[PDB]
């Protein structure tokens, strides 16, 4: 969280948090209500979002479900959808925290070799993240979507 970032910077400098850090913490505390609204809307309407994202991705990339792909088995398809759900839950956690750090420490760092070891294409998963973010933004309101979008864009950045 932003509190963790500020306190870590203060500890690194061996000092108490500064005025700017304290005011940033105040701003995050003010925006916590909209953070809660983000979490509620995402968590309570994931299923439509996840279904639309998975269908759109498999339509755009008719390889994994198709021959020579990655989602032959129903178990593999369930794993792909479970990865969708886990990424969106991580996105909710990160939005609530106000910083990238929960997503970064949960499902971001090392994700490239994470899915290299599983043979899932990194461009494929980044396309999946793009479609999931598009679905969530379309399903959210304008200011709500604008607030939530940079987190998904950062995840897309880290993936590729």
């Amino acid at each position: 969280s932003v509190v963790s970032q500020v306190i870590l910077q203060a500890d690194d400098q061996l000092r108490y948090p500064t005025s700017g850090e304290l005011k940033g913490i105040q701003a995050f505390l003010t925006t916590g209500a909209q953070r809660i609204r983000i979490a509620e809307t995402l968590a309570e309407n994931e299923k439509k979002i996840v279904d639309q994202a998975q269908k759109q991705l498999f339509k755009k990339h008719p390889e994994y479900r198709a021959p020579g792909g990655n989602a032959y088995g129903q178990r593999q398809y369930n794993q792909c959808l479970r990865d969708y759900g886990w990424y969106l839950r991580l996105v909710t956690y990160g939005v609530l925290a106000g910083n990238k750090e929960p997503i970064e420490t949960t499902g971001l760092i090392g994700v490239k070799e994470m899915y290299n070891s599983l043979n899932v294409p990194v461009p494929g998963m980044v396309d999946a993240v793009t479609v999931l973010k598009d679905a969530a933004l379309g399903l959210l309101s304008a200011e709500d979507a604008n607030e939530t979008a940079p987190y998904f864009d950062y995840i897309i950045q880290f993936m590729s």
Partner: protein, 169 residues
């Protein structure tokens, strides 16, 4: 590094002056531009990798020899290094757009670019050509998007061009 506010503050502190009306006006201009700065930074963050990939896919067609023999991106290793440099250019340009000053650009990009690239044998003309291609893509995407103010975007890339470009004339 110094952003616009910090560079103005340092400039005034040099003469030992209090922030006057001109200082307040420049600060107001930057603070009003900050919304568009954040917007452009968010857009470039959203489309970053695609922007650099498209810029390379245009630059290697503008100067095809960088992928043919004796070219500087011949291997996949050289190709990935070139794309890494392009990504670095885009990221530091984004930082400079948000900071509204090119000193963060200078301290971390330009101050030894010619030395390093000459040592590695990298051309110093195609790199600025790719820089300008990235800037064109960025400004075209911004114009397509709902960005009311976009003039400032050409400043960082053009400063990179002016600094890292050989003095032809």
């Amino acid at each position: 590094m110094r952003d616009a506010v910090t560079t103005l503050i340092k400039n005034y502190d040099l003469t030992g002056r209090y922030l006057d009306r001109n200082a307040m006006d420049e600060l107001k201009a930057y603070f009003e531009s900050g919304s568009a700065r954040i917007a452009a930074a968010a857009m470039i963050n959203a489309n970053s990798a695609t922007i650099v990939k498209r810029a390379a896919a245009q630059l290697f067609e503008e100067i095809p020899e960088l992928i043919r023999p004796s070219g500087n991106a011949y291997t996949t290793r050289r190709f990935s290094a070139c794309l890494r440099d392009m990504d670095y250019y885009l990221r530091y340009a984004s930082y400079a757009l948000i900071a509204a000053d090119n000193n963060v650009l200078d301290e971390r990009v330009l101050q030894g670019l010619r030395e390093t690239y000459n040592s590695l044998g990298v051309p110093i003309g195609p790199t600025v050509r790719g820089i300008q291609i990235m800037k064109e893509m960025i400004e075209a995407m911004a114009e397509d998007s709902s960005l009311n103010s976009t003039d400032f975007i050409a400043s960082p890339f053009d400063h990179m061009t002016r600094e890292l470009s050989e003095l032809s004339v």
